[PDB]
Design a binder for these strands. Structure first.
Lengths: 131, 59, 53, 98, 68, 162, 71
RNA sequence: AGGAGUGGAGCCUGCGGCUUAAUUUGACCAACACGGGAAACCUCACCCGGCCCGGACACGGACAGGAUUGACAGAUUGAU
RNA sequence: AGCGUGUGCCUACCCUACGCCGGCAGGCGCGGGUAACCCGUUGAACCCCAUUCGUGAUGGGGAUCGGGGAUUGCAAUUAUUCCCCAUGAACGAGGAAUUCCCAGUAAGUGCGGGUCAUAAGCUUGCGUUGAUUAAGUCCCUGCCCUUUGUACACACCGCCCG
């Protein structure tokens, strides 16, 4: 994170409220901010051993030196809502073999992890073949 | 009962099907008499594989 | 040993199985089938049906 | 194990009483209902009959996803001594069929 | 003037905090922002946009041609 | 003990019981000259008439085999105990019983014997027993590793219509 | 379908070390039996088995999901 | 003799070619909305990681201060 | 208007009337149906009757695409499906070629079943509206029978010459 004017200040507060309020909110107030698909995942789910991830992120964020990011926490889970608390961590996300690392921005909140790591080569061609 | 399904396993060749059908039949005779002599005489004197269901009352 | 061996199968094409040997691929349910279309044919003579049309 | 020593008895004793066993081909049976009552959470019937069958003492049919194990004379002698039973007891059956 | 919120173009734009109705030349300006945003974060979306390929779940094998 | 399934589904489940049994038995009574079954539910009792030509080998000494078979069905389909009752039956005129004639030819062949003389021997029996005509096919290998077919036919036959 | 390609690790099951057996009961004089650490307190435990002297961790091995003191 | 179309346009779907770590595979009038084949997982045969044995039976070896079985926490690990 | 279908089945699941709440998707409370019994006197579409638009790539066409709301599931991202507002493309009757069809038939038009936790532009059946053209021929393509010729029989996709 090194951005400005994307969740506080002049230009952009996250649907009328700053990041600072979100962190003090429970999930209950947070989900009522319009993003329909998110609300399913919380109200139904309520932690199906996402426990393993969310403790490692906070932990590693704490122990890491000031003005420096942590190492990585890795996942095969490409599914989990990006949240304000998660921001500042660095996460490697399994594709089919490869853990593509990404920094979490406050501007990515609401999205999934798996949108920021691709799982195919974009494509080139080609020279049509024989048949 | 209709069943309309492929005639070819592992589909190849001209596309064909096969209609099978089963026809059930129902019919019922209503008696009003003492339940004893009915349940006595009913269950006997049946040669073929044909089902019978006795009911206490319906009317 | 292990603490897992299974994962939710509750719907879909993997939580029902057809009676060849536990064969699949050949999705089947009809009127209480659970009976494989290849063998259904071999039971045209057997009881359930006699072909008439 | 391979299986406990309790669950051996409960199969070998049950076979001796009916003279025949039957079961289904599965590996996700949770407690094996349909006798042996709620103490076989896995293969165990199939796995123990197969070892018994290797050494004779039983015959085995299989038809439409169901086993059928038929106890034989040799296994009756074995099971009788193995389970310390009277020198003449068969509770499976013993009468003439008319 | 009591036209309902659901009947608008935009409900909670996103990062602006309100219900809005957008008209001609402001529509384009708003639209171009959301494109830029999805390449800023660089989600799957902005990459598909920048490559000039279909955003939504669609086959591109037999769909397109400009080329042949 | 209730309620009870739809009338449509009532016939399907009967057919499944009629069919499964008919292939269960064929894998055990093959050597005893199996020829079919005929089931009948009767008042508070099941009858399963186990048709085979030689009731001797079916019965066994002290009725052991018939006792095995009844105990099987009593557990397998989850019948109420003691309701099941088996009966045997010998068929007279055995050459109209195609199923048994075919499965007898099988053990003659698998016993280790020539094909031509075996096919002739079964043929004249089913012709003698009474029959307008009759036919035999043997398709598969013999005298090398390419397949052939061998038809042996006598009398009348039909192939078309009801 | 095709044959397995070489690994650079694989190891199956640990050999579950071949420790000397029963020194858990200490004898210094008779008929006295000098027990060390406490014998397991659960109803489902028989309390004839010892608990682990595993200091900074205190755990019944008969239990396999429960009853872990640590002080 | 005529009727309605296809080939033209947009879209769905199958097939070839190309790409890819894998883009599983059969089929070339009598293949090509065909293999009930409208694949989120399952299915699944493919690719990449991790675990398990569900290697019967026989013979020999081991072996009742004992053959052997399982597991908390910490570390490790996508993973409790 | 018709052929059907429906929970008590596989392992967890049916078809829905009625009442209430919501623009809609939908939610919620009650009741029936083992079925010529309840859903369903299946109160379907095209068609029919009256307004509006006016020859304009137009209000024809609805591709592409932004934002938001619901439902299924353990999980919906490369958008499962459904709904609301906005965006408004090709396309203005189609080359060389080619398919299918003779009476409730072609064509137009809707519905049920199949796969199905969620979901038909597919397939299989069913009703509804309902023409024009023929009553023939071997021209093309192909097939049956006879006669004839052959260096062919792996049979003209054959065989064979410099």
């Amino acid at each position: 994170v090194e951005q400005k004017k994307k969740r506080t200040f002049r230009k952009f507060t996250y649907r009328g409220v700053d990041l600072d309020q979100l962190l003090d909110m429970s999930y209950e107030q947070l989900m009522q901010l319009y993003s329909a698909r998110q609300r399913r995942r919380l109200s139904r789910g309520l932690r199906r051993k996402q426990h393993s991830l969310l403790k490692r992120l906070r932990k590693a964020k704490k122990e890491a030196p000031p003005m420096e990011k942590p190492e990585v926490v890795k996942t095969h889970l490409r599914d989990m809502i990006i949240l304000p608390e998660m921001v500042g961590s660095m996460v490697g996300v399994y594709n089919g073999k490869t853990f593509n690392q990404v920094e979490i921005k406050p501007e990515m909140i609401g999205h999934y992890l798996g949108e920021f790591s691709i799982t195919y080569k974009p494509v080139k061609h080609g020279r049509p073949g024989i048949g | 009962l209709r069943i309309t399904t492929r005639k070819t396993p592992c589909g190849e060749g001209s596309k064909t099907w096969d209609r099978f059908q089963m026809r059930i039949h129902k019919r019922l005779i209503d008696l009003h008499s003492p339940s004893e002599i009915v349940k006595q005489i009913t269950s006997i004197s049946i040669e073929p594989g044909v089902e019978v269901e006795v009911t206490i009352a319906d009317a | 040993q292990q603490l897992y061996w299974s994962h939710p199968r509750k719907f879909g094409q993997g939580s029902r199985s057809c009676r060849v040997c536990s064969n699949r691929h050949g999705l089947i349910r009809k009127y209480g089938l659970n009976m494989c279309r290849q063998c259904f044919r071999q039971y045209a003579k057997d009881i359930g049906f006699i072909k008439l049309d | 194990m391979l299986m406990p020593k309790k669950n051996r008895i409960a199969i070998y004793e049950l076979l001796f009483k009916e003279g025949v066993m039957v079961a289904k081909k599965d590996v996700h049976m949770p407690k094996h209902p349909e006798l042996a009552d709620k103490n076989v959470p896995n293969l165990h019937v199939m796995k123990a009959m197969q070892s018994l069958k290797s050494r004779g003492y039983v015959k085995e049919q299989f038809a439409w996803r169901h086993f059928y194990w038929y106890l034989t004379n040799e296994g009756i002698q074995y099971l009788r001594d193995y389970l310390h039973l009277p020198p003449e007891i068969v509770p499976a059956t013993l009468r003439r069929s008319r | 003037y009591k036209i309902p919120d659901w009947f608008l173009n935009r409900q909670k734009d996103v990062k602006d905090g309100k219900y809005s109705q957008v008209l001609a030349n402001g529509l384009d300006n708003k639209l171009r922002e959301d494109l830029e945003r999805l390449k800023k974060i660089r989600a799957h979306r902005g990459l598909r946009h920048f490559w000039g390929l279909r955003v939504r779940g669609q086959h591109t094998k037999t769909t397109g041609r400009r080329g042949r | 003990m209730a309620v009870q399934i739809s009338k449509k589904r009532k016939f399907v489940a009967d057919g499944i019981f009629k069919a499964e049994l008919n292939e269960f038995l064929t894998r055990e009574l093959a050597e005893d000259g199996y020829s079919g079954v005929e089931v009948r539910v009767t008042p508070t009792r099941t009858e399963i008439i186990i048709l085979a030509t030689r009731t001797q080998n079916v019965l066994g000494e002290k009725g052991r085999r018939i006792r095995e078979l009844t105990a099987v069905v009593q557990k397998r389909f989850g019948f109420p105990e003691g309701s099941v009752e088996l009966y045997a039956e010998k068929v007279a005129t055995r050459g109209l019983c195609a199923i048994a004639q075919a499965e007898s030819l099988r053990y003659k062949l698998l016993g280790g014997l020539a094909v031509r003389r075996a096919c002739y021997g079964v043929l004249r029996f089913i012709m003698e027993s009474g029959a307008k005509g009759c036919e035999v096919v043997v398709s598969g290998k013999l005298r090398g590793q390419r397949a052939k077919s061998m038809k042996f036919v006598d009398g009348l036959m039909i192939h078309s219509g009801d | 379908k095709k044959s397995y390609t070489t690994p650079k690790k694989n190891k199956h099951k640990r050999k579950k070390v071949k420790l000397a057996v029963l020194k858990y009961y200490k004898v210094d004089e008779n008929g006295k039996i000098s027990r060390l650490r406490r014998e397991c307190p659960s109803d489902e435990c028989g309390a004839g088995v010892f608990m682990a002297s595993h200091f900074d961790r205190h755990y019944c091995g008969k239990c396999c999901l429960t009853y872990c003191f640590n002080k």
